[PDB]
Design a protein around this nucleic acid. Structure first.
Ligand SMILES: [Mg+2]
Ligand SMILES: [Mg+2]
Ligand SMILES: [Mg+2]
Ligand SMILES: [Mg+2]
Ligand SMILES: [Mg+2]
Ligand SMILES: [Mg+2]
Ligand SMILES: [Mg+2]
Ligand SMILES: [Mg+2]
Ligand SMILES: [Mg+2]
Ligand SMILES: [Mg+2]
Ligand SMILES: [Mg+2]
Ligand SMILES: [Mg+2]
Ligand SMILES: [Mg+2]
Ligand SMILES: [Mg+2]
Ligand SMILES: [Zn+2]
Ligand SMILES: [Zn+2]
Ligand SMILES: [Zn+2]
Lengths: 127, 82, 138, 147, 83, 104, 97
RNA sequence: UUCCAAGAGUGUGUAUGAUGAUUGAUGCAGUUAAAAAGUCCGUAGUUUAUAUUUAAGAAGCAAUAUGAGGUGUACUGUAUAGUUGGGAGAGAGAUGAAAUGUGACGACCCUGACUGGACGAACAGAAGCGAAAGCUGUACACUUGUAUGUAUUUUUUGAACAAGGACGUAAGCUGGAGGAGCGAAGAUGAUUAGAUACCAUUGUAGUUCCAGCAGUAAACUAUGCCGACGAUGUGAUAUGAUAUUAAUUGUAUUAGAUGAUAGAAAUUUGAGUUUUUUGGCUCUGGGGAUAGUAUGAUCGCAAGAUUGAAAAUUAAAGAAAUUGACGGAAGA
């Protein structure tokens, strides 16, 4: 996951300094499903990406609500009974935070992973 | 000052590979001789010496950058004519 | 060596690095069976041969009273330290003693040099009680 | 970023997006198919052909005047099949110059270091080709001997 | 093939010393070797007498050294005559 | 930079003869082409015997205007210059292609 | 700790330099890690400037000067007070000519 | 004598766990405290950019741009030393100060000619090239890098590496050539309680060339290799565009200053993006001392090199920085 970690490190540098926009020189189908989950819960504004018969580009507009985003490598196979263990490790409080799992239904939250009783490989976290 | 919508000065600053949209900088041209009137197909950055059609002599020459026109020989770019 | 399918290379590497633990190295070689001074037990028995004193290190100054014995289980010669005041007057030669250790993992503690054992019983009479005066020596 | 040296240069050449049929040519299409078979049967490289075809004739991309076929693929349809590709053949020719050079000058050991880098660059291409079944399996390049 | 590092001097056996047999291996390699003929171009020149080298095919004798076909002090004086 | 200077003399013109022309080697074949006037040019090496060499100079004037070119090398060198099966004393050129051997 | 930024000398992107020799002691020193001075002295003294004027067969002439370059190791240099110990915060000043 | 803790129990001792984030997958550290092989190539094992069709890589042009990159033939530069023809007739040379040594079979100085060996002054830089060790007289021959431009071929051929392979200042070894200056070992003159050391006079191996072994350095940027993002100002090397005699601009390296971060601190565009710890891969360390010492195995003509413990011991060893005291240390 070279492309996913390269995305997350550029955001933490940008969101801490307080910039408005961001331009990256690589696009990927894993990163596009990442941002749609970030767009759904309301952490960022709109974003866009350009195809140019090359690696592709990505343009995102921030609003200043991110604390830290991250990625985990290697991608561990987690069963259904250990999601309660991982959630205590990587999250500050029980009331908020999010996780992304690469389940066969799609990249979904840990709330939907428990609610549909599906365990899979883990991707990353953001809050 | 938008990154998604660049202005024409910011296009003039950037490298040709790191633009928002990939457009090359090579085109084809037609050179007109001064004494005789012959036209010849040519290139922006040619790698070899072209000669005039009639009166075979020096017209372009290979350089590190753009091609050098020897003498007074006016040219223009050509394009699609469908 | 961080990978999902790298368990064979991870276990082989971490066994090598574990050998530089100074406590774990003696467990592999089994030095407590090879080079033990007293054997493997809490106490021992012996026969007294000498009654001699030593002199402690700097900056203190005294004379520490000891005794050179010979063990029964192994047959070696060793020295032990008489641990209380006026207790050497009970001890005669050609007698039996019982020896207990100091409790600092095989090292010498205090300012007594090179000695790691102390006497506890003489003729099946407790020396801690005999200093108190409860019993009498036959 | 380079294979056998430390460089990070970016100086390349970019072909355009969605190239259509060129109309500014002055020589007809059947004549431009005639001379390219004269060049290949005479023995010039396929990389040298695209250089000349851009300069003196006026067509830049060689995919459009043909029927959407690449240049090495287009030659196969008319019997001129290339057995060993060109990246192998230029490397064995460059290697024979240095073995010629060492037989005169023996004390030059800077050149002996240069032989190891190019031969190791040769074997990484041949070993991958035998996986793809491009060259026959019992093929060895012909090298000059060393005295 | 049977010998590890002695070579042609294995005929001497286990006598005459160690460094005396090293000096025999340098000389006996260049004496028994055949060389190219400068006249005909074939590799048939052999030695038969001290200072006389002759070819098998063209049968032309050449003067030379004791144990080598060319002498290292013999070739340096050819270069100064070429200039 | 890298630039290899091209060979200019008959060292360059001779490998073009073997690819695009017809030839024969051997002294016996070299005498036959001179008598029947079917040879164009003759290339000799430096290692011919002195008797067989001057016989070819005397006969080439008698056969006509056939030229003779002198190579400075051994038979093993001439087989390394252009690829031949065996080492050769003399070379006889029956027909040529794109070579500039006669115009030189 | 480290005392100076460039460690002893001003050499970068190289591997080695051939050594030169001091004039007073005569020990080998690399050419970067040397102390070199330049001075120009005339042949005649200023104290003898007027006395040559009464002895000149010529009418007017110029008095000539010669130059010199010297090299030293740093042991000889500080002993002859060519180069002195400076303050720590004042070590970073560089007097180019 | 009196007080405290536990209480039908309470202490002493030998193993073995936890304390220990001092075995670290979660989860340690590798400039200076212990710790990155001298530098590259390359197999097994580990690993991977992709909207499945395209970047990167490899091959190939132009400017014959630019460069103490390498190897070989031919010439050339002054100086030190020696042989010799003229002139002349007492000291020359060294040191803080002197002594042995040295000169009327004539030195030392100024001149006229010769033979040999070593080395390229001044220009000469916080400037260039090389994987590292390294690389400065001229003209040709052979041979080789990185970077900038660009509608050129192929289509994923990639990064790092147990086994194996090559190069590697300086000494040191066997064989042949040479030997001007310098010079370990050895021998003399002074200083000294004593000098077999510093000072001075001699003097051999060596340092020069060719063919081979050998494989150690404070081989140091004491900082492994690949990949994404970063604040202004003054410079340097190469090269392209705009523009035209007046400038401001693109890419790749590199020097320095001020802020900002991080750090135990000195310091610092990475040694930053870390207890809100994860992009991939090889090697090394676990309190001092014994000790890079014994023993075994593999290399080498030898000297020696790589691998590499323990018994008995000991409460400290160590890194950065403030205040004093001292200097046979320096200035005002
Ligand atoms: Mg205890
Ligand atoms: Mg590599
Ligand atoms: Mg060095
Ligand atoms: Mg620790
Ligand atoms: Mg230290
Ligand atoms: Mg250290
Ligand atoms: Mg010079
Ligand atoms: Mg550069
Ligand atoms: Mg491994
Ligand atoms: Mg190895
Ligand atoms: Mg070697
Ligand atoms: Mg070492
Ligand atoms: Mg080191
Ligand atoms: Mg290193
Ligand atoms: Zn014209
Ligand atoms: Zn013969
Ligand atoms: Zn000095």
């Amino acid at each position: 996951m070279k492309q996913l970690s390269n995305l997350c490190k550029a955001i933490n540098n940008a969101s801490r300094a307080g910039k408005r926009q961001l331009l990256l020189h690589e696009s990927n189908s894993v990163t596009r499903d990442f941002l749609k989950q970030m767009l759904k819960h309301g952490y960022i504004t709109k974003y866009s990406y350009v195809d140019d018969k090359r690696k592709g580009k990505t343009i995102v507009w921030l609003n200043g609500r991110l604390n830290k985003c991250g990625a985990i490598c290697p991608n561990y196979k987690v069963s259904l009974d250990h999601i309660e263990n991982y959630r205590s490790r990587l999250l500050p409080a029980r009331q908020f935070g999010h996780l992304l799992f690469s389940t066969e239904k799609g990249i979904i939250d840990h709330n939907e992973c428990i609610g549909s009783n599906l365990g899979g490989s883990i991707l990353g976290f953001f809050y | 000052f938008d990154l998604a919508f660049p202005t024409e000065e910011q296009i003039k600053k950037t490298h040709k590979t790191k633009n928002l949209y990939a457009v090359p900088t090579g085109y084809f041209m037609q050179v007109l001789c001064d004494g005789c009137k012959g036209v010849t197909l040519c290139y922006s950055h040619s790698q070899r010496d072209m000669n005039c059609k009639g009166c075979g002599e020096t017209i372009l020459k290979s350089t590190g950058g753009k091609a050098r026109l020897i003498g007074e020989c006016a040219f223009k770019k050509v394009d699609y004519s469908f | 060596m961080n990978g999902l399918f790298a368990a064979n290379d991870l276990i082989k590497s971490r066994k090598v690095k574990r050998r530089s633990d100074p406590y774990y190295r003696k467990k592999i070689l089994g030095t407590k069976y090879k080079h033990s001074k007293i054997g493997n037990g809490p106490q021992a028995k012996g026969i007294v041969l000498e009654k001699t004193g030593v002199e402690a290190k700097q900056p203190n100054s005294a004379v520490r009273k000891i005794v050179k014995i010979q063990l029964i289980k192994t047959g070696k010669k060793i020295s032990a330290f008489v641990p209380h005041d006026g207790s050497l007057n009970y001890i005669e030669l050609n007698d039996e003693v019982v020896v207990e250790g100091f409790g600092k993992k095989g090292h010498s503690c205090g300012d007594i040099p090179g000695i790691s054992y102390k006497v506890v019983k003489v003729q099946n009479v407790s020396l801690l009680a005999l200093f108190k005066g409860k019993k009498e020596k036959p | 970023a380079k294979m056998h040296s430390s460089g990070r240069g970016i100086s390349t050449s970019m072909k355009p997006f969605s190239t259509m049929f060129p109309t500014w040519i002055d020589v007809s299409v059947d004549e431009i198919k005639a001379d390219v078979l004269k060049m290949n049967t005479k023995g010039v490289s396929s990389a040298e052909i695209g250089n000349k075809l851009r300069d003196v004739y006026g067509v830049g991309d060689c995919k459009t005047i043909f029927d959407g076929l690449s240049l090495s693929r287009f030659l196969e349809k008319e019997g001129n099949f290339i057995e060993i590709p060109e990246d192998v053949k230029d490397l064995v020719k460059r290697a024979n110059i240095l073995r010629k050079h060492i037989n005169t000058h023996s004390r030059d050991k800077d050149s002996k270091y240069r032989l190891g880098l190019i031969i190791s660059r040769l074997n990484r291409c041949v070993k991958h080709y035998k996986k793809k079944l491009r060259i026959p399996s019992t093929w060895k390049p012909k090298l000059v001997e060393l005295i | 093939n049977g010998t590890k590092k002695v070579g042609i001097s294995g005929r001497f056996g286990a006598r005459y010393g160690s460094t005396l047999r090293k000096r025999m291996k340098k000389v006996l390699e260049t004496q028994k070797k055949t060389y190219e003929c400068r006249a005909c171009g074939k590799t048939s020149v052999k030695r038969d007498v001290v200072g006389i080298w002759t070819c098998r095919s063209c049968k032309i004798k050449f003067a030379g050294g004791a144990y080598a076909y060319v002498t290292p002090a013999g070739t340096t004086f050819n270069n100064m005559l070429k200039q | 930079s890298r630039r290899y200077s091209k060979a200019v003399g008959l060292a360059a013109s001779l490998p073009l003869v073997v690819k695009t022309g017809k030839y024969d080697i051997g002294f016996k074949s070299a005498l036959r082409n001179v008598i029947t006037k079917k040879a164009k040019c003759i290339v000799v090496s430096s290692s011919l015997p002195s008797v067989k060499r001057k016989q070819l100079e005397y006969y080439c004037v008698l056969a006509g205007g056939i030229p003779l070119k002198f190579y400075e090398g051994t038979n093993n060198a001439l087989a390394n210059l252009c690829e031949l099966k065996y080492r050769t004393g003399v070379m006889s050129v029956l027909h040529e292609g794109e070579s500039d051997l006669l115009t030189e | 700790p480290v005392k100076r930024k460039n460690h002893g000398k001003n050499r970068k992107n190289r591997g080695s330099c051939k050594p030169v020799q001091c004039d007073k002691c005569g020990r080998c020193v690399p050419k970067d890690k040397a102390i070199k001075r330049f001075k120009i002295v005339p042949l005649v003294e200023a104290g003898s400037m007027d006395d040559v004027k009464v002895a000149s067969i010529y009418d007017i002439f110029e008095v000539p000067r010669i130059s010199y370059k010297n090299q030293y190791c740093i042991s000889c240099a500080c002993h002859a007070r060519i180069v002195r110990v400076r303050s720590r915060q004042g070590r970073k000043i560089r007097y180019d000519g």
